[PDB]
Amino acid sequence: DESERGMKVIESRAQKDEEKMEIQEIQLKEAKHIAEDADRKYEEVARKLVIIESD
Amino acid sequence: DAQEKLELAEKKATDAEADVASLNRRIQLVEEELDRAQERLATALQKLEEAEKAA
């Protein structure tokens, strides 16, 4: 019961951690894409700053 | 005296034999109960292996 409960607690934990893993991984890809977008919008506006600044 | 000793030796034989028979019964009962304890032990040990293996 303790090794099985353990296995089930761990399976539950493993699943919580697996979901958090996948959730954080999917959300990481999105956070990275937001960083790409955040850097992208930064570049669009910063580039405008440079263009406007160049002008 | 030899005759009384005989009745008493015959009685002792009767009792010794009654004890042979009563003990044979008891020895057999402990042998049967032993086989049962051993069978229950083999069972408990197999269950122990199953429980421990489950663990």
Swiss-Prot record, chain B:
Detected in primary breast cancer tissues but undetectable in normal breast tissues in Sudanese patients. Isoform 1 is expressed in adult and fetal skeletal muscle and cardiac tissues, with higher expression levels in the cardiac tissues. Isoform 10 is expressed in adult and fetal cardiac tissues, but not in skeletal muscle. Disulfide bonds: none annotated. It is found in: Cytoplasm, Cytoskeleton. It comes from the Eukaryota. Binds to actin filaments in muscle and non-muscle cells. Plays a central role, in association with the troponin complex, in the calcium dependent regulation of vertebrate striated muscle contraction. Smooth muscle contraction is regulated by interaction with caldesmon. In non-muscle cells is implicated in stabilizing cytoskeleton actin filaments. Belongs to the tropomyosin family. Homodimer. Heterodimer of an alpha (TPM1, TPM3 or TPM4) and a beta (TPM2) chain. Interacts with HRG (via the HRR domain); the interaction contributes to the antiangiogenic properties of the histidine/proline-rich region (HRR) of HRG. Interacts (via N-terminus) with LMOD2 (via N-terminus) and TMOD1 (via N-terminus). It is linked to Cardiomyopathy, familial hypertrophic, 3: A hereditary heart disorder characterized by ventricular hypertrophy, which is usually asymmetric and often involves the interventricular septum. The symptoms include dyspnea, syncope, collapse, palpitations, and chest pain. They can be readily provoked by exercise. The disorder has inter- and intrafamilial variability ranging from benign to malignant forms with high risk of cardiac failure and sudden cardiac death. The molecule is in a coiled coil structure that is formed by 2 polypeptide chains. The sequence exhibits a prominent seven-residues periodicity. This is Tropomyosin alpha-1 chain. It comes from Homo sapiens. The gene is TPM1. The chain holds residues 66 to 120 of 284 of the full protein.
